[PDB]
From Swiss-Prot:
Tissue spec. comment: Blood plasma. Sperm. Highly expressed in the lower head and midpiece of sperm. Significantly reduced levels found in the sperms of asthenozoospermia and leukocytospermia patients (at protein level).
Subunit note: Monomer. Homodimer.
Any one of the GO BP annotations: innate immune response in mucosa
Role played: Has bactericidal activity. May act as a ligand for C-C chemokine receptor CCR6. Positively regulates the sperm motility and bactericidal activity in a CCR6-dependent manner. Binds to CCR6 and triggers Ca2+ mobilization in the sperm which is important for its motility.
Highest classification ranks of the organism: Eukaryota, Metazoa, Chordata, Craniata, Vertebrata
Protein name: Beta-defensin 1
Residues included from the entire protein: 33 to 68 of 68
Naturally occurring in which organism (per UniProt): Homo sapiens (Human)
One GO CC term, this protein: sperm midpiece
Cellular location(s): Secreted; Membrane
């Protein structure tokens, strides 16, 4: 979720992740990805 994602340094993003991150969970009612 957003809380776990951003508190650990990840970003909540609706589309693909930036370099050196990958999908690790979701944000925003499951609609976005947590990129970390």
């Amino acid at each position: 979720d957003h809380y776990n994602c951003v508190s650990s340094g990840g970003q909540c993003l609706y589309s693909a992740c930036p370099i050196f991150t990958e999908i690790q969970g979701t944000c925003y009612r499951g609609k976005a990805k947590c990129c970390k």
